[PDB]
Each structure stands twice: as C-alpha cells, then as structure tokens.
Design a binder for these strands. Structure first.
Ligand SMILES: CS(=O)(=O)NCCNc1ccccc1
Ligand SMILES: [Mg+2]
Ligand SMILES: [Mg+2]
Ligand code: NA
Lengths: 815, 240, 334, 49
RNA sequence: GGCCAGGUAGCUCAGUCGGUAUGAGCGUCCGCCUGAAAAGCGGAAGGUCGGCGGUUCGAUCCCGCCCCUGGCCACCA
C-alpha cells in the first residue's frame, strides 16, 4: 500500500485553472515528476480502440442473455448480466479491434466491459442515464485519449496523495500560478446557522478536528454522472452511489478523506473514544473486527459507527434507500491509525492518507465541497448547520512552528550559488510564509507540510525544485588515511592463500539447518547449541543463528557433490553468533543527545558475542588425476595443512594436539593452539556424523577463530653463515602416543644453536620395533656462524639432542 | 603441452573480490574501513537513524527480529549502524566505508536475496556539500564501471538523510541503471552522536554488491551468487 | 587513483609464486663474464646486443642484462654451493635491450620546459627496458617426508610456473614446442598469449648446465610481462541445475601430436554440451604401434535446459572423435 | 602433528615487501605510484635537477 | 484469509484414489570388456512419496493443523 493513481486530464484540469492552456507530453510530465522526487511506477494509456466502438441503449433482453441495442440513427443490432432495459452500454460492432488485437466480428458484435476496453477492472460497463446519446463515439465518451499515472509516494509527502498535492507540485516545477482547489474564494462557503449533530470527543484520543454537515432529501434512485464514475475507476475506486462516490472523489481531489453516514440511523450523541478490550464492530464490509484498547472509535447511544480513520461500520452504512446523509470530516492521529490499520490488515484509502497526516485546515472546505456536490448530482438539500470540533481550546491556526535558517544555507548544502531570491521564492512557492531579518530567513511551513521541521527539510525543497542536475561533481579533499587495519589485511592474505591452494570461497548462510546439532550428536550442554533465534525466519525449521560456520559450508559441500562436482574444497570467512545469556535488549535511549559510554557499553554487552571465524571443508580427491598419476583422496592431514596455510598467512606459529570434539573423528581430530590459547579444531569428521548428514565419506573440516589469533608484526634479522654445513640423521624410538612434533622439539632443544634445520622423513613401525612403539628418523643440518665444524662437533650436538629426547619423550636411540 | 597443474587453483568469491576492489578505491581516496556486528540493537539500527517509532520497516514483515518479541534486537537491515558506531567512537573528521552482510525479508529468486552484501559510505567534515557527495559517487562509478561512467541523482526519501536521493549509473559496456541511494546526513543523526549540525555536515550512500555485480556482468540468476556452487566461483579466477 | 593494473598484477604474480614455493631475489643488471659464451648463443643473438658500462666495479662485467636468467642462475649456484640444493627462485625486474648503438642527446636548455618532440627524442635514444618475470629450479621440487621420498624438478614444473603466472595475470596461454638456447631443445616450450610470443620455459640444455656449473636437470622460465596484455574479464557463469553425463574417450595419435591439440580437437567437435575435459592417461604399450601413443580423456557433458541421454552424449563424443580424426589424425582406440 | 606441507611456502623478498608497505602507506593518503627507466639520460638525471 | 494445483531417488521429473513407486532419464555399484578406461551388453544398490497425528491385518493413495511453492475466485468508503 503506497500507490497513487490519477488520470492526466484531471491533473491538468486543476493546473490549468491557474495556468490557462497548460499541457505537456506524458513523457515530459514523467520526467518532471521524477526530477522533483516523485517515483512513477507505470504510465498506462487508455484503450486504444478503432472502428465501430459505440455506445448504445438496451432495447429488451431475451434470456446468458440476448438483447438488441440501439446503436444510433435508428439502427438495431442484437448481441448475445447486471443490466436491465434502458441502460447505456458500450458495444464493439463488427470491424473493431479491441486492445490486444482482439478483433470483433459476427451475435452482431460484443458487449464491452471495463476490462477489455483497457479502462478499469467485473461484468459489463454501464453508463449512467444521460451520459451519452446512443450512437456516440465510444473513444470520445470513455475518454480513451487519457493517460493514467501510477506513482509511488514517499511517506514524507502525504500531501501528494491527491490531485491537490500533485497539481501544486507541478505548478512549483513549472513556475505556474496555482489555484488551490480547497480554497474559499471560488464559491462562498456554506452557511453556518447552528449545530449539525451533538458529539463528544475524548481529547486524549488524538483527534485534531471533527466536522459534520448533513444533506437532507437526496434521490435514492439517482446515480453518479459519468465524469465522476470515470475518474473514480481510473484512480482505482469502483463507483457505488452518489453519497459514497462524492466522499471518495473529494478524498482524491483534495486529500481529505470523507465518510457518509445515514442520518436516520444515528441514535443520539456521537462519541469519539478508545475501544474497550474485546469490543467488536461490524465494519462496512460485513466483516466483524476485534478491537484493541489503542483504537479510536465513533459510537453513539447504541452501536459503533466507525473505526477511527480506518473504515466505517454497517450501523450507519449508506444503503440504496438512504435519503438523509450526515457527512463526516475528521482528522485522526496518524500513529493511532497506523497501529490500528496494520493490526487488522485494512490498508484503506483513508487509512493510508491518515497515517501520512492530512491537512487539518481544509476539513470544512472539503466538507462543503462534498455536501454541495452530493446535492447537485442527487437532488438533495444542503442543511445550513455545521459542527466543527477543533480541539480544546478550539484551534484556529494550524500552521507549524516557524523555522530559522540562513538565506544561503541551501547554496552551501548544494554547492551551487543559486540566483538571489531562489530560496525565498521556492519556499513561498510550496506554500510557506517567508520573512527576512538580515541574512536569516524565518519560514513557517503550510499546514499540509508537517514534514518541514528544520532547515534540512527546507534545503531539500529548494534543491529538488531547482533540480539536482545543477549540482556539480567535486571530489572532496582526501583525508590522510591509514589504510587497512592489520586484521583486514590478514583476512585478504588468508583468502588469497587458501584460494591458491585450491579452496573455493562461499558466502555462508547464518540460518542453521534443521536439527544439525542432533545430526552431529552433540550433548545438550554444548555451547554451540546455545543459539540465537529469529522470530520471523523465511524457514520456520531454521530459526537459529550460526554459532559455527561448518553447517553452512557442509550445506554448500552437499550441493556441489550432489550435482556432479565430487572433488570439492570450500572455505569461508565470516562471523558467528554466540550468546552468553538469554536474549536481552536495552531500553530506548533518547535520540536528542549522544549516548554516554556506559550506555554504549550497555548496548554492546546486551549483544551476543560475534567473533570472525575462518572455516573450510574438503571431500573427494584433494589432488586430481592426470598424466602424473591417479590423484590423492582427501585425508585428515589435508585439513591440518589448511591450518598451516592459514597460520603462515597470519604469520603466527601454531601447535596441534589430539582432541575429542564433535563432529570430528576422535582419533583424527586436532585442536589448534597459538601459544597456549585454543583457536579452533581441524581433522576428519566423525563417520556417524557423516552417515547421518548425507555427507561423502572421509569428509574433513577446519574452523578457526581469527579474533583469538593475535596479530603479529615480526622483524626477522637472519645472519647467513658462509661456512659449510654438516648433514646427519638420527633415528629415535618412542611410544606410539608420543607426537612427532614433541620429539622434534626435544631434538631442537638439545642440539642447540648449531642446528640449522630438522625435518622428519620416516615413521617406521614393524617387526623390528616393539608393540605400541614407533621409530622416527629426522634429517639434521648443523652449521656454525663463525667456523667450519668437524664431524665430532656435530655428533656432540646430536648426542645432546638424543639425551634431550630421552628425558623429555622417553626416546631410545635406534640400535 | 601436457597438463602440469597437480593442485588446481581455487577461487575467492566474486562478491568478496568486488568488495575488495571497492575498498581499495576508497582507501586510495583517503577513506578507511570499519566493521560492525550483524546482530545489532534496534537503537543503532533504527532509533539513532531517525526512524520513527511507527515506521513500517520496524515491523516483523520486513526485518528479521530476534526472539522473543519486542527484544529490541534484530539482524541489521543495512550497514548504517556500523557508521553510527564509528561516528560515536572516532574523532572528526570521519571518512569511512562499511562493507558487511545485510539481512532483508525478500525471498530468494533470480533477482532478490534475503542475505546480501552492501557498501555504505559516510563522510562527516566541515563544509561537505552535495557536490562532494556527487564527486565521490562519480569516482565510485568510474572505478567499477569504466572511465565513461557517470552518476545521476534524483530526489527521494530516506529517514537518515535530508535531502535524500537515489543514484543511477551509466556504463557503456551494457543506459541508466538504478544503483543505490545517498543524501546529506540528517541533523538528527548528528545530534544523536554528539555532533554539532551547525559546524559539521556530511553525506552518506549505499549500494548493494550483489545488485552491482548482477547488471555489470550480466549474471542471470542471483541464486548462483549465494548458493556456493563451485561452477560459479571458479570462472572468476583465483583473486590473489 | 591507487595502484595501476600493472602494479597490481606485479604483486599478484609475486604472491602466487611465493605461495607455490619460489623465493624472490633481487637480480643484478651486470651480466656475468662470458655468460652468453657458456650458453652457446650465436653471435647474432639479440640477447648479445647489450648496453655496456664505462666504469663498472668489475671490468669483466660491464654489460647490462638483456635477460634475467644469468642473475637467477648466479643466485641458484650460490644456494646450491652452500648446502641448499633444493631451491626455487624467481625475480621480477626490468632488462636493458638496446635497439641501436649508444646514441646521446645534446644538452637541452634547462631554462624552459622541453617540447613534446624533445621529450620523445630523449625516450627514443634510450634502450628498451621491458619488465620480465623469470624463475629457476633445481634439486627436489617437493621435499621428502613421512609421505614419501619427494619428487625431483622436471620440465613440467617450469611449465606449471608459466600457468601460475598466467592465472595471476588472468590471461590464457598456450605452450608450443620450440628450440631456444639455453633451454633443452626437446624440453622447451614457447609461451604464447594469443598469437604473440611472451617467453620460454622448460629444462635447460645439458651442455649449458655443464659449461656453467649448474645442477643437472635445472629448469628455467622467462616471460615478458610487457608483452602480456592487462585483462579485465567479466565472467557471467550460468550454473545448470541438470545432471551431467560422464564418459571417457580413448584416442590413438602419432607420438609427435601434442596432447593439447588432441584436446582442442575434441573440444571443437563436442560442442557446447562439453562441460569439462581432462587428460588422465598416456599409454605407449606393446598393443600401441611404434611412434604412436594412446590418450584417454575424461569427458563431462551437461545440458543447460534438459537431462541428457547416453545417446545424446555419445553423439557429441562421436562428433569429437571425428573432429580429432580430421585435425590430428586420431584413431578411436580399438 | 605430523608434517603436512608437501609443497613448502616460498618467500617474497623483504625489500619488495617493504617497498609494498611504503607504497600502500602513501596510497592510503591519496598519493600515486610512478615508474621510470633504470638507464636514464643525463638530461633528466642531472641537468633537469 | 475461503477453494485449487503441487512437495515423489543423488540431479531433473513422471505416476498411482490400499498389499510391486515391477518408476523414467541421468548420477552410484558389480560383471563381460580394456594395460587402465568409457561406450555397448548383462546385472544390482538407493525413496521410510513434505512433517505430526486420526481410521485399517495393511496407508505415498483415506478425514485433521503446520513447514513453503506458484496460481484463480472472494473481499477493496
Ligand atoms: C537497495 S539498497 O538497500 O541498497 N538502498 C540503499 C539505501 N541506503 C542508504 C545509505 C546511506 C544513505 C542513503 C541511503
Ligand atoms: Mg525507489
Ligand atoms: Mg524533506
Ligand atoms: Na596423517
């Protein structure tokens, strides 16, 4: 609900009163509306038709119907369900081509409807008695040369929800003299010879104005003229009866929604009050509504008459036999109407305009316009009584407070030296009072512009009318920035490294799959289970936010594998959502000041922990096959290498230790450490998790917490030794549980500073080695910084490594 | 001529690469990057951004809210709260861009996605005008759409800007295309961050990355941009 | 405006080679004494047209480098001679390639701006100085460990170094057999970006290795970065939701037929249904005739709008075999 | 904890990385990076200076 | 929000108003075949037919709300 439709002929008509002969190309008007800030959605021409598309009168029906129609000049043709005898209908005689290539031919034709005529939405089109002589041109009577404009009105311009607002806007853009169709100086206003109906208004309900004026003795058989019905259809409102058609027509013309009550079905004093709890009201559509304590109502001594600014009730609904009409012109609270209409899903044409505010100064003027228009088309008598409740005390000036701003402020904001008097002219053009006092203007916006509250609002008005095209393109002087932070730079390096190693980056979704942790088999107290729920998720079975990136990567892994790509390596760098308590939010902080640091820290403390993780998953062949060989399947060490790749990218050292942590395989899982802080896990997934998740066999995964990895800025200073090295190997036998890194560390500890490099190249079990033991052979390279070594010098450092390995991991020299 | 690649290269995501190219463009103009949480308080997501209390976007239909009801905690509908935090945490002048994940209610089809990435810029200094906004947007458009690129602004509405505008872009590689929104920072936002509107003015802008990449490269189905199919990322190269 | 496209590419190439195991050096412009005599180059070889320095720090090294390999091979000898025998080096620097004798330009008065013609004259009198990327390898390419004994450097490692540089530059290259010293004439590929030569790669000639004191099987690569155009591709991938069809095709060709030419012929005939092709077997057993080889490619067919049948896929495969028969004289294995 | 790096990472030269860091520093302040030939005329190396 | 049409194998889809979905194409596995492959030929595996319940010896097919799918009618002071 945001649309606004009106035909061009009506809009031009209101503009032409002040600017005689004004007329523009529909494309030119589309560009003008766009340039001043009105988004058009569609520009729909009417029709078109050609050939014999004429208006005729029904002679008599022979019933699926069959009736002869006077097509004019005493000619009769018979064609073969909401029309009697004498109704003026539109016929498509043979030889005519309706919109869409639909050519009519011999039934001597076809009875036309507003649908296929490209004129409205429903049966057949019935013209009111006296609309056109039987035989006139259908295109000229229907006005198919017209063009309907469909606009999307922004919520700050509720005054543009009418012909009055858009006509004023065009007069502003074209520098035209404007005659407000809601002024008094056309015909004199109606007499006020006493009260029209007693009413009581609860002042705490938000009503600003409540007007009433009756029209007595209308013809119940009267019908709205064709020009009024046609303009309603082009604006998206279907005609009903004169009492209702004038309330909608005036709402479209002036922007003040009107409502017609049956004066003979009002019992006593009218009352505006809040609805009680559980109170109901049968609305005009025959649908019973459940009301809230924050809803405004119109009631009398019996039942409820209307829902305040939303829709009237069936108690006072105008019917086909109504003769005494009491017209209502009220100004409701926009917030109260918005809360009400959205709670019960009633985007009414009156509600949409009331939540965007309605000009309170035109309530009586629109009331007199509506009353005189009803009596003219229905033959009624306008009563000279008027009730005009305007608050307590009665308000006689609806002008917003004045606004002070410098005369050249729009010049500064736009960066354009506008000609002198531009600001004062444009602000007076949109209807504001502008006075001078040196270089400071004092601007009082009109009553239909409540959005104008501070100088910034006035700047928009001046700039949009002068046109944003005149604003030049000036690059600002660049500040002396510091570039990327260390963490931002590091996330680039990690992404580049993993991509060059064969990983493909995905954008992970934060909504966890349904029951993923039950598929993983986690315990109830697992911190990853304590997720943050979304109240309105796109999938009700996926409300929880992601505490870990693996479920999203595994979902993309299954997508690739299920579509023929079975050898996949994916990764992702994104944040997770980890709450430390139940969902708790802080109260509203006043927006007219800066929140203190204690309030800012209170807002941060109320939010779940959201650290940035890096994760990866692997399946299928890690290395593809080719002329070199058959390739290599993914194994746990590939996930460990992914850790090393990320670590080298981060320029920090990591150590891996065996760990049991679902969904990883307990015997093929490593916990990553930087110093003594745990930063994540890696390895092969549990076979039970893989089986329950529909994952490929042998799937491996990594997930690290980047925020737990400290940033590093190493400044190496290596000293290259010109002296030769000494190569030696050492074979050590340890228990099978002893990590190979722990043995290498112990060797490096004993060898001292002579050890230049150490590399493991053989892990040997078998018959020569006892049960639950293993032999490790390391390649050592010794080099001195100031001399050439002898073989005994290197052997001493090697023996010191053997003794260090003996007392630290229980190693025995291989014999 | 035998194949020699024993380890085939991977691919960084095109949205991440586009985000990196956008970041480098503004770093080269002296700006900086800032981050923020994706689960944001309603204070910084709507209240501090001059959103009225009865705004339709505050409803449960257009915004992912964190259960239970009325928790004043949600998934951010834009990266604007990241710039509210920077305005509160940093000293003036401020020239920052924020590139983060954004959550809207739209269903996932060929041209929409509920989870998308957008770039938002925020500059607050003494004497910043709409001309400086237009100048920045044109440099932004030239870096992403070519030397013949130029922007067009039309008046519009946004709760946190006044005046507000929508940005259209022209690129010859194939007319004007709707790109994003911009405007001068609303004075209520500055007072909500302790900044004097009479001494400091500012502008902001916001474009979605998925939207930008779609019409720039002619990608037909945006579902390929978020579903993580390897066949979509690999053609874009490694991205080192 | 930030970094140019060439300066950004120069970084991406360095990051890629370093992440692949290469160590960057800073090459010296002064060529080693008689390096082109060790390479056995002809007296008319364009690399011999060097710019010479009047007062060098070593009178036997006055010439400026027309190629980056002599400096890389010098650093390669330094590492291997000091215990580091498994080494992979690379360098990104400019060369000095004069197109004429040393011709100077008289003094332009410095009381004014030089005219655009005078600026162009000063540039033309200077030798051409394009930017090159080069690399050398020796010893083990992959080290030994608990996985196995490692793999020694072979010519394919230098060929892969080209494709690493090509992917970093986002260009497509083709490798063609060529004879070009100091490379091994039977293990030397000429690199082309389109139809423009940008350099060479492969194993070095064994005689050059002997006369230069290099490790056996040393490989090398040198590309002209200025000859590679900066590319800005805008891909628009369309992911098909329909399943694929997997088939393998075995073709017998002459031994001299490059495997890439067979794949190009298969690709040209298969049509748009061919989603991916990959060579995974080269067989020269007794059932294959002399001077012939059997090639087996893994084909992957997928339609963008439908599910295929085996007959639909076999139609594209048989069309690929016919194209292979017409272009490289392939015979279906039987 | 077994070694898993089958292809050992290399190293870009420190001088190149220092130059890259200096370049990023000034580019973050709006500056740009220029180039020039190593073999230069005496007009630009001395006389114009 | 009152009526429909639909959710079915790894992918894309047919199809049944009760005991067998003798499910299709492609994907997966075995054999003959090849040095190893693929095609071809001959065999198989795999779905709790959208979820939770209600009737029957027996339920994808038969009544009751929901997950989320594109569409009509109705409502539109
Ligand atoms: C289609 S959109 O979500 O990307 N619109 C962007 C609007 N955001 C915005 C941000 C700063 C200033 C003005 C507007
Ligand atoms: Mg818009
Ligand atoms: Mg405004
Ligand atoms: Na292992």
């Amino acid at each position: 609900s945001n649309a606004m439709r009106l035909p061009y002929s009506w809009l031009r008509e209101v503009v032409a009163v002040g600017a005689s002969g004004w007329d523009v190309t529909p494309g030119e008007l589309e560009q003008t509306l766009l340039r001043i800030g009105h988004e058009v959605e569609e520009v729909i021409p009417l029709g078109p038709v050609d050939g014999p598309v004429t208006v005729g009168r029904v002679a008599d029906i022979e019933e699926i119907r069959a009736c002869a129609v006077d097509i004019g000049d005493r000619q009769y043709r018979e064609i073969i369900t909401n029309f009697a005898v004498g109704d003026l209908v539109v016929v498509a005689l043979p030889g005519a081509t309706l919109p869409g290539g639909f050519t009519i031919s011999a039934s001597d034709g076809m009875i036309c409807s507003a649908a296929e005529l490209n004129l409205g939405a429903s049966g057949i089109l019935v013209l009111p008695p006296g609309a056109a002589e039987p035989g006139a041109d259908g295109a000229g009577v229907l006005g198919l040369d017209d063009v309907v404009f469909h606009l999307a009105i922004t919520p700050d311009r509720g005054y543009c929800m009418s012909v009055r607002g858009l006509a004023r806007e065009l007069a502003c853009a074209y520098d035209l003299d404007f005659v407000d169709p809601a002024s008094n100086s056309r015909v004199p206003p109606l007499p006020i010879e006493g009260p029209a109906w007693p009413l009581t208004v609860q002042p705490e309900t938000g009503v600003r104005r409540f007007a009433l004026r009756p029209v007595i003795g209308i013809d119940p058989a009267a019908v709205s003229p064709w020009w009024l019905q046609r303009r309603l259809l082009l604006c998206g409102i279907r005609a009903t009866c004169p009492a209702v058609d004038v309330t909608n027509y005036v709402m479209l013309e002036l922007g003040h929604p009107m409502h017609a009550h049956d004066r003979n079905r009002i019992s006593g004093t009218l009352g505006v009050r809040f609805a009680r709890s559980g109170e109901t009201a049968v609305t005009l559509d025959g649908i019973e509504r459940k009301l809230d304590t924050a809803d405004v109502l119109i009631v009398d001594d019996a039942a409820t008459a209307a829902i305040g600014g939303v829709m009237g009730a069936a108690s006072t609904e105008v019917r086909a036999d109504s003769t005494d009409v009491l017209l209502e012109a009220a100004i409701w609270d926009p917030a109260a109407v918005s809360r009400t209409q959205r709670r019960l899903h009633l985007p009414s044409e009156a509600a949409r305009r009331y939540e965007r505010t309605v000009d309170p100064a035109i309530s009586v003027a629109a009331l007199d316009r509506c009353a005189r228009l009803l009596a003219d088309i229905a033959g009624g008598e306008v009563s000279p009584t008027l009730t005009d409740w305007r608050g307590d005390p009665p308000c006689d000036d609806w002008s917003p407070p004045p606004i002070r701003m410098g005369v050249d402020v729009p010049d500064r904001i736009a960066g354009v030296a506008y000609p002198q008097g531009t600001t004062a002219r444009r602000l007076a053009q949109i209807g504001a009072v502008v006075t001078h006092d040196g270089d400071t203007l004092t601007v009082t916006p009109p009553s239909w512009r409540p959005d104008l509250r501070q100088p910034a609002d006035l700047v928009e008005e001046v700039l949009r009318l002068e046109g944003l095209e005149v604003i030049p393109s000036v690059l600002p002087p660049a500040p002396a920035g510091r570039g990327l932070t260390a963490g931002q730079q590091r996330r680039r390096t990690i992404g580049r490294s993993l991509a060059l190693s064969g990983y493909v980056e995905i954008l992970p979704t934060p909504f966890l799959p349904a029951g993923v942790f039950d598929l993983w088999g986690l315990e109830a107290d697992d911190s990853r289970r304590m997720t943050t729920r979304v109240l309105n998720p796109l999938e009700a079975d996926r409300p929880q936010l992601a505490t870990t990136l693996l479920p999203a990567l595994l979902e993309a892994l299954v997508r690739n594998v299920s579509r023929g790509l079975v050898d996949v390596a994916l990764f992702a760098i994104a944040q997770v959502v980890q709450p430390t308590e139940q969902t708790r939010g802080v109260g509203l902080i006043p927006v007219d000041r800066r929140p203190t640091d204690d309030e800012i820290a209170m807002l941060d403390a109320s939010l779940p922990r959201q650290p940035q993780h890096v994760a990866a998953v692997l399946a299928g062949l890690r290395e593809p096959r080719g002329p070199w060989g058959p390739g290599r399947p993914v194994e746990a060490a590939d996930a460990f290498e992914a850790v090393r790749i990320i670590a080298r990218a981060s320029r920090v050292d990591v150590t891996l230790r065996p760990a049991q942590y679902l969904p990883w395989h307990p015997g093929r899982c490593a916990q990553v450490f930087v110093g003594e802080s745990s930063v994540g896990h890696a390895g092969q997934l549990h076979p039970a998790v893989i089986e329950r998740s529909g994952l490929p066999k042998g799937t491996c995964a990594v997930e690290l917490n980047l925020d737990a990895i400290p940033c590093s800025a190493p400044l190496p200073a290596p000293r290259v030794s010109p002296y030769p090295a000494v190569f030696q190997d050492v074979s050590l036998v340890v228990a099978a549980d002893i990590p190979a890194q722990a043995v290498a560390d112990a060797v490096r500890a004993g060898a001292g500073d002579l050890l230049e490099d150490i590399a493991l190249f053989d892990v040997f079990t078998g018959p020569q080695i006892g049960e639950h033991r293993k032999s490790l052979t390391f390649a050592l390279r010794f080099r001195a910084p100031d001399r050439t070594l002898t073989e005994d010098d290197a052997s001493a450092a090697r023996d010191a490594a053997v003794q260090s390995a003996a007392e630290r991991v229980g190693a025995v020299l291989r014999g | 001529t035998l194949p020699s690649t024993r380890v085939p290269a991977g691919a960084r995501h095109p949205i991440i690469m586009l985000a990196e190219h956008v970041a480098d463009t503004f770093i080269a103009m002296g700006w900086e990057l800032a981050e923020g949480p994706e689960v944001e308080t309603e204070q910084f997501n709507f209240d501090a951004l001059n959103f009225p209390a009865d705004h339709p976007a505050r409803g449960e239909q257009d915004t992912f809210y964190i259960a239970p009801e009325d928790s004043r905690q949600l998934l951010r509908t834009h990266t604007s709260p990241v710039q509210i935090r920077t305005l509160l945490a940093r000293e003036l002048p401020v020239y920052i861009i924020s590139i983060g994940r954004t959550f809207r209610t739209d269903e996932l089809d060929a041209t929409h996605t509920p989870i998308f990435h957008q770039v938002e810029g925020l500059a607050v200094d003494r004497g910043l005008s709409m001309a400086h906004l237009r100048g920045t947007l044109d440099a932004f458009a030239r870096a992403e759409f070519g030397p013949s690129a130029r922007t067009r602004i039309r008046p519009h509405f946004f709760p946190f800007t006044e005046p507000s505008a929508e940005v259209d872009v022209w690129f010859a590689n194939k007319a004007w295309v709707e790109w994003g929104g911009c405007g001068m920072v609303h004075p209520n936002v500055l007072r909500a961050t302790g900044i004097d509107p009479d001494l400091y003015s500012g502008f902001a802008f916001g474009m979605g990355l998925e939207r930008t990449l779609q019409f720039r490269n002619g990608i037909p189905d945006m579902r390929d941009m978020v579903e993580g199919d390897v066949r979509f990322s690999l053609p874009f190269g490694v991205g080192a």
